[PDB]
Design a protein around this ligand. Structure first.
Ligand SMILES: *[C@@H]1O[C@H](CO)[C@@H](O[C@@H]2O[C@H](CO)[C@@H](O[C@@H]3O[C@H](CO)[C@@H](O)[C@H](O)[C@@H]3O)[C@H](O)[C@H]2NC(C)=O)[C@H](O)[C@H]1NC(C)=O
Ligand SMILES: *[C@@H]1O[C@H](CO)[C@@H](O[C@@H]2O[C@H](CO)[C@@H](O[C@@H]3O[C@H](CO)[C@@H](O)[C@H](O)[C@@H]3O)[C@H](O)[C@H]2NC(C)=O)[C@H](O)[C@H]1NC(C)=O
Ligand SMILES: *[C@@H]1O[C@H](CO)[C@@H](O[C@@H]2O[C@H](CO)[C@@H](O[C@@H]3O[C@H](CO)[C@@H](O)[C@H](O)[C@@H]3O)[C@H](O)[C@H]2NC(C)=O)[C@H](O)[C@H]1NC(C)=O
Lengths: 147, 49, 451
């Protein structure tokens, strides 16, 4: 997508995403260069840092990450909503009791949405977090889980 | 995520081409200042962006 | 060895009484008049946070770091949780807080408010609940929500949950209560803020017919601030939580030293009850004082720059100060105070109060080691010759108005038992039936089932 009228110049910073200190350092390094827009990801815990530093300084931020819960300015996002499609799929399949193995690394918005619509539609959700299990003993915990 | 990145590059290119086609000059240099300015006054031409 | 100990204060909105208790605890520490428990002078700097955004919190933290401190007492919400934990774990600055406990296990964070989910699950196992309603917001962590979900998985419970953090209209609360009435729900657990709990209880009182036969477990430590007076006048019992014991003599000495303050230098001190956050602030000041006394007794060094240096290069002594904040064993206003290797509370005690129709009582205390340790209507229908009215029935009162076979039968039952009774009449005139749609028993059967 190179054009003829101008030329982009991306300043690539390969830092961490969970540690908000490195995110703040990379943001201030990009801001000291005087940029007009910032493309990047954000973690589930560091969403507030991105929304704060991009709404206060009025600098646009384009992301492919998960949709937020609320209307934050200067946050352009690429991933659409997943909760409405999933509720439409369950209502097409006409379920009443099911299990929901979720991960706690992209927020808990989908869990709250499916619990609210399940209680509004009188369903039985067995919702279990799986993200708190380490990589060292993830065989007997999964066996006890499916037991 | 890679496909959404490939689409977001197209979105940014189309938006910057719309700025280049609307004759809006927002060109500046690398003197945006400190990120911890107190009070950090905004610059209005980002509001159009 | 300083001889100059300056700390930092991060105060958000609605932190007036907490700021007053902070300044009053600093004043109590500086006016000891003893060379043993007061070996130095304590200073502080206060930065009031206007907004909950990470920008102002980052500016305040970098101002406290460029000023030069040894510890930072502060508050945080969901919007400023990760910002404070990341900036205080990266620059090795110890951060003391009375706010809600974090979900993840982090470093350099000393939490004064203890965890609540153990006592909640212990009271759920003690009351044997298997089908209840769970109102929750998001503003005090997700550990309690995940604990309730895991306990409903393990113990086969039926939890009907509502995320009520984004709801502003009270009509939504009314229709949720009406929907839970349509599900015949009688047991509630509300993990929300104090103002939201007061709003839900006001909607219970205004909507009405939701007191007798109901139980509201309020999983919140602000039990002294919950306006539950109109709920108590209807016949509902409430299971609450407190960590501030008034029988503790240090607490009542703090009350006697607290009510004599002026409004000008210490606002919200006389015209309001003592919140639990102010007691946690005072206990945090006691922990910081004990930590710096232990640092002086062990001759450990504690002795500027930018908060965004590349690389950071933090000063390595503060980890020992973190150790000094992880081995404090004192007796403050919340009882015993210790800390683990993550800065969470241990060896503590949560007081549980039940306010039934007989009145208020202390129903037991909770400990993470052992357990939560705790410490006649007669109805009939007018049928001949079973129950009939007398001739001059209006000329009398009580059970003497009626007569017949079942009246004499009830008198003989009361003679062979010896317990006073009360003859009542069923209103709807139906004997007993269950509709196939509503699944509701009517008549005397519905009077016996629905109490
Ligand atoms: C200053 O404040 C403290 C408040 O207790 C007092 O210092 C205390 O001094 C004693 C002297 O040995 C320390 O040991 C204690 O001795 C008593 C009596 O033998 C004993 O019953 C205790 O179990 C303990 O071993 C004590 O640890 C120490 N307290 C502190 C907090 O350091 C002192 O009385 C006050 N006044 C002056 C003028 O120093
Ligand atoms: C107040 O909250 C409690 C839950 O903490 C509600 O549950 C229980 O209700 C029963 C019915 O009165 C009572 O206990 C029962 O006692 C009989 C003996 O009289 C026993 O045979 C039963 O197995 C049962 O334990 C008591 O109120 C309470 N149980 C306990 C242990 O406290 C109660 O319904 C709530 N009150 C109201 C008015 O909603
Ligand atoms: C950890 O939590 C436990 C609760 O399970 C608590 O332990 C209690 O600590 C106190 C303070 O030392 C003990 O009181 C003293 O015990 C000694 C005997 O060792 C006695 O001579 C003293 O007169 C005084 O009573 C108490 O026995 C102990 N246990 C219980 C069941 O209360 C405490 O909160 C934490 N323990 C520590 C050591 O911090």
């Amino acid at each position: 997508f190179s054009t003829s009228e101008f030329r982009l110049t991306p300043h690539i910073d390969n830092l961490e995403v969970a540690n908000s200190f490195a995110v703040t350092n990379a943001f201030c390094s990009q801001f000291s260069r005087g940029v007009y827009a910032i493309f990047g990801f954000y973690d589930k815990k560091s969403v507030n840092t991105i929304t704060s530093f991009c709404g206060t300084l009025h600098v646009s931020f384009i992301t492919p990450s998960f949709p937020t819960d609320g209307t934050h300015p200067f946050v352009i996002q690429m991933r659409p909503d997943l909760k409405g499609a999933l509720l439409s799929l369950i209502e097409y399949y006409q379920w009443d009791k099911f299990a929901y193995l979720y991960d706690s690394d992209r927020g808990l918005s989908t869990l709250q949405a499916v619990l609210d619509s399940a209680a509004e539609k009188k369903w039985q959700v067995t919702a279990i977090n799986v993200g708190n299990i380490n990589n060292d003993k993830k065989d007997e915990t999964y066996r006890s889980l499916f037991q | 995520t890679s496909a959404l990145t490939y689409d977001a590059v197209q979105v940014m290119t189309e938006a910057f081409r719309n700025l280049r086609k609307q004759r809006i000059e927002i060109s500046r240099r690398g003197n945006a200042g400190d990120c911890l300015a107190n009070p950090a006054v905004p610059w209005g031409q980002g509001v159009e962006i | 060895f300083p001889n100059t100990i300056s700390i930092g204060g991060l105060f958000m909105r609605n932190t007036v009484q907490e700021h007053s208790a902070f300044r009053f605890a600093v004043q109590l520490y500086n006016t000891n008049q003893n060379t043993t428990e007061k070996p130095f002078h304590l200073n502080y700097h206060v930065d009031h946070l206007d907004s909950s955004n990470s920008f102002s919190v980052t500016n305040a933290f970098c101002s406290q770091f460029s000023r030069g401190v040894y510890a930072i007492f502060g508050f945080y919400d969901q919007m400023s949780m990760n910002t404070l934990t990341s900036f205080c774990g990266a620059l090795h600055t110890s951060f003391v807080t009375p706010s809600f406990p974090t979900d993840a296990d982090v470093q350099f964070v000393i939490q004064m408010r203890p965890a609540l989910k153990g006592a909640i699950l212990s009271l759920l196992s003690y009351y044997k609940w298997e089908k209840f309603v769970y109102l929750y917001d998001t503003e005090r962590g997700f550990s309690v929500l995940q604990a309730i979900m895991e306990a409903a998985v393990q113990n086969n419970w039926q939890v009907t949950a509502r995320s009520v953090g984004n709801i502003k209209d009270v009509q939504e609360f009314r229709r949720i209560i009406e929907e839970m009435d349509r599900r015949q729900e009688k047991r509630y657990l509300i993990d929300c803020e104090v103002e939201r709990i007061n709003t839900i209880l006001e909607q219970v009182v205004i909507l009405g017919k939701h007191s007798r036969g109901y139980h509201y477990m309020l999983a919140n430590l602000g039990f002294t601030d919950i306006l539950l007076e109109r709920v108590m006048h209807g016949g509902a019992n409430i299971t609450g939580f407190q960590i501030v014991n008034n029988e503790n003599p240090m607490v009542q000495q703090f009350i006697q030293r607290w009510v004599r303050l002026d409004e000008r230098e210490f606002p919200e001190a006389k015209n309001a009850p003592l919140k639990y956050t102010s007691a946690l602030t005072h206990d945090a000041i006691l922990v910081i004082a004990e930590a710096f006394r232990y640092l002086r007794r062990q001759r450990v060094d504690v002795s500027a720059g930018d908060c965004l240096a590349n690389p950071a290069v933090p000063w390595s002594q503060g980890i020992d100060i973190e150790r000094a904040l992880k081995m404090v064993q004192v007796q403050g206003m919340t009882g015993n105070i210790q800390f683990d290797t993550y800065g969470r509370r241990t060896n503590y005690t949560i007081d549980v109060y039940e306010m039934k129709v007989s009145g208020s009582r202390k129903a037991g205390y909770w400990n993470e080691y052992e357990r939560f340790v705790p410490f006649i209507v007669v109805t009939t229908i007018l049928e001949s010759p079973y129950v009939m009215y007398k001739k001059n029935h209006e000329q009398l009162e009580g059970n003497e108005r009626y007569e017949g076979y079942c009246v004499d039968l009830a008198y003989e039952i009361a003679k062979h038992v010896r317990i006073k009774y009360k003859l009542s009449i069923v209103g709807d005139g139906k004997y007993g039936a269950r509709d196939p749609e509503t699944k509701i028993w009517n008549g005397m059967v519905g009077e016996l089932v629905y109490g």
